Every structure is written in structure tokens, then in C-alpha cells.
């Protein structure tokens, strides 16, 4: 079962937010969204660029093996 870190990211709108998925690997929510495999191959960055307030919410990575849920919060500048 993949690990999805951290349990909570809080950013300001317009900032970047980068979760780590550790383990076909997908990023779900219960362009601007990118997945990057790191050199080591076990760990992937699941990044949001130019975060918007509507990005706020609950996310998982799945390999169907699902990680624990994590939360994104995008505050108002």
C-alpha cells in the first residue's frame, strides 16, 4: 500500500504544494497537477503549481492499492 506524505500541507494561493507518494501510480482527489518520479524510483512528487483555493481538499495516491488520505489547504493571500 503506497505511503502519501504529509497528512497535511497548507499553502497560500499562488504557491506550490508537493506531496510525496512512496511505493501504475495515480493521484486522486476525494494541468497545474504534475507527477514526478524521483531518481531513487520508490518516491514520487505529486505537485500542484499556482495553487488555488478550490484545490483545497482530500487526496490519495493509488497504485488497486490506496494510500491513506492527506489534506491540502490553500489559504487566501
Amino acid at each position, epitope marked *: 500500500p503506497p505511503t502519501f506524505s504529509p497528512a497535511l500541507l497548507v499553502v497560500t494561493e499562488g504557491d506550490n504544494a508537493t506531496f510525496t507518494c512512496s511505493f501504475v501510480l495515480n493521484w486522486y482527489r476525494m494541468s497545474r497537477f504534475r507527477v514526478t518520479q524521483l531518481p531513487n524510483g520508490r518516491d514520487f512528487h505529486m505537485s500542484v503549481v499556482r495553487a488555488r483555493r478550490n484545490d483545497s481538499g482530500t487526496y490519495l495516491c493509488g497504485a488497486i492499492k490506496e494510500s491513506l488520505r492527506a489534506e491540502l489547504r490553500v*489559504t487566501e493571500r
Partner: antibody
Amino acid sequence: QVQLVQSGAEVKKPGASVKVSCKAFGYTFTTYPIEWMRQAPGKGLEWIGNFHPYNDDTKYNEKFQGRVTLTVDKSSTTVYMELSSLRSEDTAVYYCARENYGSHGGFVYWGQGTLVTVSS
Amino acid sequence: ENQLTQSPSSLSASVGDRVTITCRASSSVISSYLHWYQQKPGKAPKLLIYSTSNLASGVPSRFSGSGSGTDYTLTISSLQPEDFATYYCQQYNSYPLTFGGGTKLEIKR
């Protein structure tokens, strides 16, 4: 068994620095930001900043004007709040706190508070 | 900063009464990010209500929260002895985080 345990009461002269510890127990240290607040007798509650062990990111209240530094020791799951150039108006109980799943900004877990008295 | 102002600053009531406290934000907050704490003398605050209306763990259902935009309330609909304390609101809508000044619930006599 989530717990935040802070260091003990401190007395300081004006101009000095304090470093207050908050040691996190009972969960994966990197999963949550640690938030800092203080409560002065007649001011109520003031937010100081936060530090995320996940990525070492810090946010600060601009009111502190770069007088606060937050640092971490991952080895001992401890976040440090260092407050420099202390003034009388810095006398307060300092708290660390964290959220929990789904609290959306609400602080579920709190350290016991550290009294810092600043005075000549 | 988004200033929060609580009303009233103090109020006196009895065991069994119902009271409502108000939190007003200088700027509109998404209601997910507005919370309430109870503080008793010599203790850290304890989260009471998160996201406007959700009771925190172990909080009795005589507490309720309501609101949105800039206007929020906390109600205790049948006071118990333990309930006399200071209540604060807090916003996690924008940095810096802010808290209200507090409302102190006292015993009427």
C-alpha cells in the same frame, strides 16, 4: 497517545533571547505542521508561526518582524521557537499546537504552555 | 489581518439556560476554516467546534456552531457547571491566523 510537551518557564532580561521546545509524541512527526501561539494577560491569543517537519517550511506572523525563528530536531521530534530581542510586551504563555485529520485549521492537540517573563 | 471580534465580551447566565456568543470577521471567511475553543483558567485552549458547526472529539451536543461569511455564532443550549469559561473563535482562512478577543461566560447570582 498524541502529546505535545513544552519546556519549562523561563525568565529573561530585555534584549535577550528565549528558545522554547515543543516535543511531539504519539504520531509520525513529519505528518503535521507545529503551530505556535502566545497568550499575554490582556491581549488574548496571538499566532506566532508554524514549522512543517515534512519539508522544513516556516510561516511567520509579520508582527514579529523577523524576531522569531522556528527550527527542528527530527532526531528528537522537537520543534524550537526562538524569540529574540525580548521586550516587556513579550511576557506570555507560549503554546505549540497541531491540527488533526479533517480539523481544517482547528488545533486539536496543544502543549501545556510555557511562561516566559521578560523584565529588568 | 482578518480581525475577529467577539460579542459580548462577557455574559452571566445560569445552569440550564441557553446562550449564544457571536464572532464577526472583518473579512469573509470560508466556513470550513472557522473554529471555536473553550479555555478554562490555568489550562491550554481546547477545540470545541471546528468548521463552523462540527463538534470536536468528546464535546457534548449541547454545544452547537452556526454561521458563514463574516458572521458566526456558538450556542450552548442548556448550560452545565463545567461550561463557565472563556470561548474564543479562530480563522484559518488567511495568514496570519487570528483569534477573537474571547467571551467570558460567568455565573448569574
